[PDB]
Amino acid sequence: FPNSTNLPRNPSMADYEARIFTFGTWIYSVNKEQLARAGFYALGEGDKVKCFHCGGGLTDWKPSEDPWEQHAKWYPGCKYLLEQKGQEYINNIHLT
Template sequence: MHSSSVPTKDLSEIFIQEKIDSDVTQPNSTLIFPSNSHYSLPTRRYASFSFFPGGLPTNIEALVRSGFYYCGNGTRLQCYHCQVGVTNFHHVPSNEINVQHLRQFPTCRYAQLSLEENAARSTNNDNTCEWCF
């Protein structure tokens, strides 16, 4: 046997890095951030607001789309992905929710990807499929 002068990596190291690189782009990655999987479904997040004080918030669709669910305590909401808790987000304009979310927890990948998706949507003025452009 002769030794190789070419440096090599163990296959498991390559797989792990590829997995990390892939998961960084996924909003539901449990490898990057643990998430509350029960509320990973938008329908469950929406249903959590049924006991919100004063009825459903006017910006509920944006809150749900941004990953928030109602905790059952005052006006406290929580991101299912990064677990950051916020209050009074039901007063935040729909187009500002992810911006405020990132101010409080700048590393939330779900909020980052949501903000990027919203920006891409606003620049996509023709009828091109949002996923294909």
């Protein structure tokens, strides 16, 4: 179950630097900057990633798909998400 509290499930991955580093060998076309910025880091197996905060896992990405958009699509309850895009952003992802 994703995290809903305000405590990062993976503290060691709270820095864009820490995270971005995991995409060192990334062979996929999904933009690793956006992924890291959206709060994800690579698990080194396939195109699987997780949110350092809510700890939600995402995989099987399509070319055009947007990290922030996805992160909100599947894990709305995430706080790190809430803090960067705000409730309004989220609500309109699900209502529309």
